[PDB]
Each structure stands twice: as C-alpha cells, then as structure tokens.
Amino acid sequence: DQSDLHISDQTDTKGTVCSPFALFAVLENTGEKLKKSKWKWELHKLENARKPLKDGNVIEKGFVSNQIGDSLYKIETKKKMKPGIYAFKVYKPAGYPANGSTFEWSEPMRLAKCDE
C-alpha cells in the first residue's frame, strides 16, 4: 500500500511517571493510505536507556491500526506498566523498501512507584 509511518508523539521521554500508568506512541502516515499493511509494534522493557536501544523483554505487542486523525494512529499499552524503562519498536511492513532502517524505536519512557 506504500504507507510510511513515523513516530510523531509519545509518552514524554523526560522525567519519570508514577506507576502504574499506560504508555503510548502516535504514528503519522506520510505515505499512501494505510490499508492492509501490517506495521508490527512491540513494547519492550529495557535494562537501560543507553543509545542505541537494545531489544528487551516484549511486554505487549500488536499492529498499528487505531486511527485518531486523518493520517494519525495511536498505539497504547492495555496493561498499565509496572516500574521500569520501556520503549516501543515499530517494524516496517512486507514490501517496504528498507534503506535507512527495518524498524524505529520510540524514545525511552520511565515509570516508578511514587506512593511508598
């Protein structure tokens, strides 16, 4: 379908959010209309936030599907996350001409328990 999604917003990478709380990323399609193209995503629990990010433990996953604006999609955890460091990893779909990269990471997001 010649779609082309990039991460345009997310849960803020600065600071630490009191847990448990959901995490999200917004993807903007700047290509042709997303039709049946499958952009797989994974929410990883990381060991650390050092760059470039490293694959961790996949906590949740899915495919980009929920349209929230004319060319805007949102991915959001259905669990609320426990304390930790996390990031979304979004893979290119079958047929995509991967020149730069086969995936895109969000910036990392941190949660910690406040009420103890």
Residue numbers in the entry: 75 to 190
Any passages from the paper?
The relevance of different TapA sections for promoting oligomer formation was investigated by using truncated proteins. In agreement with the AUC experiments, the addition of 50 µM TapA75-190 to 250 µM TasA does not lead to a reduction of folded TasA (blue curve), supporting the notion that the N-terminal residues of TapA are critical for stimulating oligomerization. The additional hydrogen bonding suggests a higher stability of TapA71-190, which is supported by the TSA data (Tm = 60 °C for TapA71-190 and 46 °C for TapA75-190). Structural integrity is supported by a disulfide bond linking C92 and C188. Constructs with odd numbers of cysteines such as TapA60-190 and TapA66-190 showed a tendency to form dimers via disulfide bond formation with their free cysteine C68. TapA44-253, TapA54-190, and TapA75-190, on the other hand, appeared as monomers, since they contain even numbers of cysteines.
Bacillus subtilis expresses TasA (translocation-dependent antimicrobial spore component) as the major biofilm protein, which aided by TapA (TasA anchoring/assembly protein, YqxM) can convert into stable oligomeric structures to form the biofilm matrix. Owing to the stability of the TapA Ig domain, it is not able to open a cleft to receive a donor strand, and thus can only be located at the beginning of a filament, acting as filament inducer.
